[PDB]
Amino acid sequence: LQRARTILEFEKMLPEWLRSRFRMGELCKVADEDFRLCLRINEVKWTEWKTHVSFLNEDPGPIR
Amino acid sequence: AAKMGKAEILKYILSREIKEKPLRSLSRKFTDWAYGPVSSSLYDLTNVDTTTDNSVLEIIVYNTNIDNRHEMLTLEPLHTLLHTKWKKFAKYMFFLSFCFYFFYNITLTLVSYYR
Amino acid sequence: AVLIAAGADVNAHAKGVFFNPKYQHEGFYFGETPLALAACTNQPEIVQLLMENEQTDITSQDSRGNNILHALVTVAEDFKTQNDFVKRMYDMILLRSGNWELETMRNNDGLTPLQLAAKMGKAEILKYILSREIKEKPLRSLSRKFTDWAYGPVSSSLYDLTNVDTTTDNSVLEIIVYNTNIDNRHEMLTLEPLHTLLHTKWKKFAKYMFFLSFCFYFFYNITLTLVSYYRPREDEDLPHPLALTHKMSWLQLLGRMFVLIWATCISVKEGIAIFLLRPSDLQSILSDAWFHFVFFVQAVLVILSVFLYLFAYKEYLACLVLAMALGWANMLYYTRGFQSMGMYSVMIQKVILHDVLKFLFVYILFLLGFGVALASLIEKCSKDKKDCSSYGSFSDAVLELFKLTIGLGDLNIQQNSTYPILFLFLLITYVILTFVLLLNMLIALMGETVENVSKESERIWRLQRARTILEFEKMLPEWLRSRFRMGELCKVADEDFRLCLRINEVKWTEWKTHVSFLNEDPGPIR
Amino acid sequence: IQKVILHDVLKFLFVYILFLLGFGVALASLIEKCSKDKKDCSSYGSFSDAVLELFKLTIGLGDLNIQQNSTYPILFLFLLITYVILTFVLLLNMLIALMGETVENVSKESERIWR
Ligand SMILES: CCCCCCCC/C=C/CCCCCCCC(=O)O[C@@H](COC(=O)CCCCCCCCCCCCCCC)COP(=O)([O-])OCC[N+](C)(C)C
Ligand SMILES: CCCCCCCC/C=C/CCCCCCCC(=O)O[C@@H](COC(=O)CCCCCCCCCCCCCCC)COP(=O)([O-])OCC[N+](C)(C)C
Ligand SMILES: CCCCCCCC/C=C/CCCCCCCC(=O)O[C@@H](COC(=O)CCCCCCCCCCCCCCC)COP(=O)([O-])OCC[N+](C)(C)C
Ligand SMILES: CCCCCCCC/C=C/CCCCCCCC(=O)O[C@@H](COC(=O)CCCCCCCCCCCCCCC)COP(=O)([O-])OCC[N+](C)(C)C
Ligand SMILES: CCCCCCCC/C=C/CCCCCCCC(=O)O[C@@H](COC(=O)CCCCCCCCCCCCCCC)COP(=O)([O-])OCC[N+](C)(C)C
Ligand SMILES: CCCCCCCC/C=C\CCCCCCCC(=O)O[C@@H](COC(=O)CCCCCCCCCCCCCCC)COP(=O)([O-])OCC[N+](C)(C)C
Ligand SMILES: CCCCCCCC/C=C\CCCCCCCC(=O)O[C@@H](COC(=O)CCCCCCCCCCCCCCC)COP(=O)([O-])OCC[N+](C)(C)C
Numbered sequence: 001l002q003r004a005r006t007i008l009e010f011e012k013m014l015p016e017w018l019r020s021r022f023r024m025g026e027l028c029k030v031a032d033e034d035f036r037l038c039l040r041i042n043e044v045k046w047t048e049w050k051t052h053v054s055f056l057n058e059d060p061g062p063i064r
Numbered sequence: 065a066a067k068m069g070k071a072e073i074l075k076y077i078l079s080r081e082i083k084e085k086p087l088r089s090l091s092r093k094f095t096d097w098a099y100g101p102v103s104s105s106l107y108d109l110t111n112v113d114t115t116t117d118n119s120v121l122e123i124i125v126y127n128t129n130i131d132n133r134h135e136m137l138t139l140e141p142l143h144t145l146l147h148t149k150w151k152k153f154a155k156y157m158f159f160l161s162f163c164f165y166f167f168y169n170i171t172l173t174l175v176s177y178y179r
Numbered sequence: 180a181v182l183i184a185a186g187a188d189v190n191a192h193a194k195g196v197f198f199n200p201k202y203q204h205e206g207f208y209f210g211e212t213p214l215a216l217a218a219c220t221n222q223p224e225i226v227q228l229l230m231e232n233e234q235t236d237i238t239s240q241d242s243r244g245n246n247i248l249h250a251l252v253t254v255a256e257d258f259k260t261q262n263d264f265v266k267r268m269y270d271m272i273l274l275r276s277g278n279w280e281l282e283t284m285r286n287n288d289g290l291t292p293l294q295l296a297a298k299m300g301k302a303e304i305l306k307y308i309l310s311r312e313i314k315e316k317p318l319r320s321l322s323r324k325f326t327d328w329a330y331g332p333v334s335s336s337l338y339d340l341t342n343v344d345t346t347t348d349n350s351v352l353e354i355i356v357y358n359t360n361i362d363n364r365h366e367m368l369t370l371e372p373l374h375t376l377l378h379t380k381w382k383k384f385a386k387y388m389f390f391l392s393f394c395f396y397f398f399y400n401i402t403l404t405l406v407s408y409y410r411p412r413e414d415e416d417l418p419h420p421l422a423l424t425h426k427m428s429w430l431q432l433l434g435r436m437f438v439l440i441w442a443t444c445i446s447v448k449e450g451i452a453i454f455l456l457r458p459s460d461l462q463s464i465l466s467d468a469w470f471h472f473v474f475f476v477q478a479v480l481v482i483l484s485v486f487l488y489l490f491a492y493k494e495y496l497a498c499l500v501l502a503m504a505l506g507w508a509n510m511l512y513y514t515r516g517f518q519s520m521g522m523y524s525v526m527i528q529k530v531i532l533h534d535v536l537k538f539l540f541v542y543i544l545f546l547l548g549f550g551v552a553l554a555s556l557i558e559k560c561s562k563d564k565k566d567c568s569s570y571g572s573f574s575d576a577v578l579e580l581f582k583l584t585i586g587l588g589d590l591n592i593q594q595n596s597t598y599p600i601l602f603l604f605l606l607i608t609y610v611i612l613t614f615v616l617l618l619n620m621l622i623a624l625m626g627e628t629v630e631n632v633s634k635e636s637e638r639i640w641r642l643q644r645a646r647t648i649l650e651f652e653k654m655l656p657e658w659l660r661s662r663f664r665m666g667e668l669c670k671v672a673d674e675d676f677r678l679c680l681r682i683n684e685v686k687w688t689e690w691k692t693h694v695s696f697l698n699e700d701p702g703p704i705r
Numbered sequence: 706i707q708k709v710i711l712h713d714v715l716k717f718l719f720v721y722i723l724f725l726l727g728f729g730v731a732l733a734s735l736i737e738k739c740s741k742d743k744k745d746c747s748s749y750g751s752f753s754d755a756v757l758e759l760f761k762l763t764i765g766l767g768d769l770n771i772q773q774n775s776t777y778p779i780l781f782l783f784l785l786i787t788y789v790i791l792t793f794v795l796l797l798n799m800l801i802a803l804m805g806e807t808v809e810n811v812s813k814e815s816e817r818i819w820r
């Protein structure tokens with residue numbers, strides 16, 4: 001909690017053309033005509049098995 | 065929910081996923097790809113990142129009325145978001161603040177001892 | 180079942196980048212075959228449906244050289260994050276094959292599935308393999324545990340020592356001890372064919388070679404102390420005893436030539452062991468090879484004290500005194516021979532890393548911070564013409580604050596200060612920050628470190644003694660090594676001899692009728 | 706009292722005598738002959754005097770004088786500060802922490818041993 005205050009103080013200090021360069025996430029087409037600028041987190045789960053419905057990409061690799 | 069400090073409702077909203085097909089636009093968590101145990105996912109950063117004003121990350125950090133403000137930064141779209149800010153631009157601005165202030169106390173000690 | 184009966188290939192490999200990644204968060208490595216996918220994803224019905232088909236090649240090897248049994252060892256995890264099915268899939272496939280062909284293949288690194296489980300550090304699979312027992316009569320040759328005789332509660336058993344003892348190269352006992360990448364290397368030496376095997380090596384030849392190393396090194400520090408304390412204290416009496424400076428037929432000349440012979444035999448021997456073991460981790464040298472550097476430094480300073488004496492530089496006392504002080508602090512290595520004094524040296528090594536180094540960083544900040552602010556306040560000492568104050572310089576005000584912490588000397592506040600009240604305010608604030616706060620918080624923080632590592636200090640000690648035993652075993656020649664061999668040949672099955680080890684035990688809670696033994700007569704033979 | 710002497714005091718007194726006699730020779734072997742001042746130039750002249758001056762520094766009696774008759778005045782300070790860290794900071798504070806374990810175990814049994 002003490003280090004999180006120090007990070008947000010330095011982010012209000014730097015100018016605008018630095019702030020656009022240091023931006024997180026990328027635009028992802030989520031649904032029909034919707035773009036929401038999401039963040040990506042990977043994980044591994046072993047205990048619960050199921051058949052996979054409701055995904056976005058069929059090809060599971062990293063694109064390019 | 066961030067201003068009053070409600071932990072269990074804020075955990076539900078920030079990672080909400082609807083599997084049922086006609087109502088999938090209401091989610092904030094989306095499975096990008098999955099193959100066996102390994103899977104990937106996307107977390108929506110629309111009104112939680114600090115790009116706008118009165119963001120959810122800003123309300124939790126600068127809040128003095130609540131007491132569990134340190135248990136609310138372990139939530140999964142907020143823990144990774146503070147780690148990425150430190151790795152790109154905040155661990156270098158913090159090191160430059162240490163060198164300008166350590167050089168400041170040397171040049172104040174030496175001009176007061178070799179007076 | 181529809182696709183296999185229609186004529187699909189059941190041997191196709193997936194050789195892609197996604198199916199064989201470079202980082203573990205980008206893909207999923209499973210063994211590249213459709214037999215290995217159905218077993219690594221907990222599907223017992225499709226595995227049984229694939230092995231009955233006569234086209235399924237069950238001994239295939241993928242691009243890494245792995246087979247079906249190497250792939251199950253790679254994707255195994257603990258009990259907490261994965262239930263048990265890797266251990267149950269390892270048993271189903273082996274009992275269906277029915278021979279030793281899968282257990283003895285070698286991949287491109289040159290490792291069997293038994294050796295690979297020790298290299299990567301998989302605890303639950305290695306416990307299953309080293310004590311595996313099949314009661315069913317036609318498949319009893321696949322076991323590594325055999326019941327020799329049993330009568331009531333008392334029974335005996337044999338553990339196979341084929342590829343786990345150190346008779347061959349890259350043994351399972353050698354991989355566990357010399358492994359630095361894993362972290363649970365001290366929980367893997369409590370397994371039942373490995374715990375008894377390290378106890379037998381200590382009882383026959385390792386507790387006597389360890390005692391002879393203590394007597395040759397304790398006699399070495401006596402004959403270095405006495406030749407450096409009873410030195411001739413005259414520059415006109417120039418010849419030192421070492422290096423044989425003057426041939427005078429001096430009585431007790433064997434004492435100061437024993438130093439030169441034994442100091443080079445350490446610096447050559449310890450130079451090799453640093454050359455072979457090449458680490459990059461800072462954590463590795465403070466946990467495995469600390470006592471190889473400090474025996475090498477102590478032997479260099481004795482040799483370097485000889486060349487600077489024959490060149491007559493009057494610097495040799497600064498290298499002999501650093502050899503006596505370092506030499507008697509190295510005697511704390513020989514405490515691992517005892518359980519009581521061995522666990523006590525583990526707790527010293529944890530307190531210095533976790534509690535002392537944090538204390539010594541904050542204390543030097545306060546001692547040098549208040550040392551300038553008291554030395555910059557004292558006026559020039561010429562009005563009393565001699566010795567008006569003890570805080571005249573920075574190098575004197577630091578010394579007077581070091582003596583106030585340990586409690587020596589006297590406290591005089593009538594200095595030559597121009598501000599006598601401000602001098603008391605900075606001196607009392609130093610006493611509160613160090614005598615009250617820091618030196619009492621150090622005792623409270625050591626109460627946490629002791630309370631955590633006391634549940635682990637025994638198993639860290641047995642890992643340290645297991646390294647010492649395997650170093651003495653590589654040193655003795657071949658005709659000693661055949662005499663000190665463990666176990667005996669036991670006819671296990673039809674034309675099979677495996678050189679097993681015997682362990683007795685008593686079990687009361689589970690009763691059964693005894694089938695599948697080796698000897699009918701339960702006594703010790705002869 | 707009978708449990709602390711067996712488990713904690715005898716282990717402390719074995720490591721402490723190793724350091725007190727180990728650094729006692731290395732400080733007594735560094736002091737030059739005391740004839741140039743003709744009387745009482747140093748207190749570390751012999752092995753039996755350098756041991757006594759290190760015993761008095763642990764319990765906290767007397768005074769600390771570093772202007773001895775040493776030929777190497779910086780090496781004399783390096784071996785004297787290293788003795789203070791190993792005994793005053795490390796060993797005498799680890800003894801109090803290890804007695805906290807022995808008391809916490811035998812206090813559940815000290816009544817039945819008494820009867
Ligand atoms: C004795 C005097 C000479 C010492 C050698 C030379 C000194 C340099 C030191 C070198 C060794 C440093 C530690 C070695 C191993 C690293 C990890 C570790 O265990 O450290 C631990 C604490 O350690 C600290 O917090 C040290 C911080 C202060 C360092 C400077 C003070 C030294 C005293 C000299 C005065 C000022 C010196 C001025 C320079 C600034 C990390 O905490 P942990 O989480 O509990 O450990 C878990 C292990 N893990 C992190 C790997 C997971
Ligand atoms: C386990 C421990 C291992 C490591 C311990 C190793 C060191 C431990 C021990 C250290 C003892 C050091 C004191 C003696 C040094 C010799 C004198 C000297 O060089 O001072 C000179 C410069 O000094 C100045 O003129 C002013 C000082 C400015 C810098 C100090 C600021 C403190 C910041 C600190 C915060 C950063 C550190 C944070 C923590 C890292 C002046 O000398 P003098 O006063 O003119 O003396 C003349 C003597 N005479 C009068 C008789 C002729
Ligand atoms: C006070 C001064 C005079 C003392 C008498 C003469 C001295 C000789 C000593 C004799 C008595 C020894 C112990 C008596 C009972 C044995 C078991 C025991 O409890 O010891 C315990 C610790 O004990 C140690 O670790 C001692 C190790 C250092 C001994 C030398 C230092 C003595 C100080 C003199 C300076 C150097 C002397 C130079 C000689 C080298 C064993 O640890 P434990 O597991 O917690 O105990 C469980 C009991 N059990 C093991 C049976 C299961
Ligand atoms: C609870 C405790 C019970 C047990 C405690 C019992 C003992 C505790 C107390 C002990 C006090 C001992 C000091 C006084 C002894 C008398 C002097 C003497 O004999 O020294 C002689 C030999 O000494 C030498 O010449 C060099 C020493 C070599 C051996 C020491 C190496 C240290 C290794 C140690 C590591 C191994 C041990 C590890 C741990 C066991 C020389 O004497 P001197 O210097 O010429 O003196 C002249 C005096 N005069 C100048 C005034 C005339
Ligand atoms: C509770 C306390 C604990 C903390 C203590 C911390 C230490 C604090 C120390 C406080 C007192 C030291 C300063 C006093 C000044 C003396 C005067 C002097 O000669 O200055 C000298 C200082 O030279 C040095 O720097 C000292 C050398 C040792 C440095 C620290 C030891 C390293 C420990 C690592 C071992 C780790 C062991 C591993 C264990 C894990 C320089 O000489 P000068 O500049 O020319 O001065 C002129 C004087 N004259 C005219 C007479 C020549
Ligand atoms: C890749 C990303 C890195 C780029 C990002 C940097 C771009 C930024 C551009 C502009 C930012 C605005 C600058 C404000 C200036 C005010 C000064 C001041 O008061 O102290 C400030 C200095 O701490 C800093 O702000 C350091 C950041 C860089 C300073 C300016 C660049 C000079 C570089 C020169 C090159 C030198 C050599 C270079 C060697 C190669 C902050 O003080 P504080 O400590 O925060 O306050 C006290 C703490 N408290 C909050 C608890 C009270
Ligand atoms: C029943 C079973 C017993 C038989 C087995 C013995 C046969 C063995 C035959 C040959 C082994 C090879 C000898 C190597 C010599 C090198 C010397 C050296 O450097 O130090 C070595 C001495 O430690 C030993 O190796 C002791 C073993 C016996 C030494 C030789 C026999 C002399 C006996 C004379 C009779 C005397 C009087 C006899 C009284 C009756 C090892 O040094 P270290 O301490 O290991 O290294 C430092 C620790 N470190 C690893 C952390 C860095």
Ligand SMILES: CCCCCCCC/C=C\CCCCCCCC(=O)O[C@@H](COC(=O)CCCCCCCCCCCCCCC)COP(=O)([O-])OCC[N+](C)(C)C
Pocket residue numbers: 465466467468469470471473476501504505508511524525527528531643787
């Ligand atoms: C190269 C310089 C070394 C000298 C120290 C310099 C101080 C600064 C440097 C490094 C900082 C010291 C931190 C120690 C980190 C390891 C802890 C440890 O070893 O614990 C040990 C306790 O024995 C001791 O180490 C306590 C005694 C302190 C060192 C002796 C000082 C000698 C006098 C100084 C004058 C001579 C000057 C010499 C030339 C400068 C036992 O722990 P362990 O459980 O056995 O762990 C080892 C694991 N292993 C067995 C598998 C290997």
Ligand SMILES: CCCCCCCC/C=C\CCCCCCCC(=O)O[C@@H](COC(=O)CCCCCCCCCCCCCCC)COP(=O)([O-])OCC[N+](C)(C)C
Pocket residue numbers: 386387389390393510511513514515516517518
């Ligand atoms: C002593 C202190 C005095 C002061 C010192 C000052 C410095 C002090 C520094 C550190 C203090 C620590 C002291 C160092 C002790 C090291 C020795 C050791 O490890 O003992 C061990 C063995 O050792 C024996 O007891 C062997 C038997 C002795 C007779 C050997 C005859 C010669 C070999 C014949 C040559 C053949 C032919 C030769 C030609 C080739 C103890 O073993 P154990 O615990 O009883 O075993 C129980 C096993 N258990 C643990 C599983 C339950």
Ligand SMILES: CCCCCCCC/C=C\CCCCCCCC(=O)O[C@@H](COC(=O)CCCCCCCCCCCCCCC)COP(=O)([O-])OCC[N+](C)(C)C
Pocket residue numbers: 517518519520
């Ligand atoms: C009054 C006793 C004083 C010491 C006797 C000294 C002379 C004796 C001469 C011959 C007797 C040989 C048989 C003794 C075997 C055990 C000794 C013992 O009980 O010490 C105990 C404490 O001691 C230590 O751990 C500190 C090390 C120094 C003292 C031990 C020396 C014995 C080594 C023998 C050869 C070196 C000969 C050196 C020549 C000078 C040992 O602890 P432990 O109980 O074994 O812990 C493991 C056992 N456990 C699993 C059951 C827990």
Ligand SMILES: CCCCCCCC/C=C\CCCCCCCC(=O)O[C@@H](COC(=O)CCCCCCCCCCCCCCC)COP(=O)([O-])OCC[N+](C)(C)C
Pocket residue numbers: 597598599600601604
């Ligand atoms: C957030 C907004 C902030 C805005 C304002 C920021 C600016 C800051 C403003 C003012 C700064 C403070 C005063 C500095 C200037 C005067 C210094 C001075 O004269 O020394 C005085 C002492 O000095 C002290 O009393 C110690 C200073 C610390 C303050 C004590 C509070 C701690 C409470 C702890 C409770 C204990 C309290 C009592 C402790 C003593 C007196 O010294 P003297 O020697 O007698 O005078 C010389 C005359 N003679 C030579 C003839 C004798």
Ligand SMILES: CCCCCCCC/C=C\CCCCCCCC(=O)O[C@@H](COC(=O)CCCCCCCCCCCCCCC)COP(=O)([O-])OCC[N+](C)(C)C
Pocket residue numbers: 472476479480497498776777778779780783
């Ligand atoms: C793995 C591969 C290894 C290979 C290499 C192995 C070989 C080893 C190589 C070299 C060994 C070290 C040097 C010995 C030879 C010179 C001795 C000497 O001159 O004394 C020097 C001090 O001596 C020291 O500084 C203390 C020695 C310990 C090293 C400090 C590191 C601890 C870090 C703790 C941080 C604090 C560091 C600062 C602590 C002071 C200076 O003494 P002097 O009195 O000023 O000189 C006389 C002049 N006068 C009389 C006019 C004054």
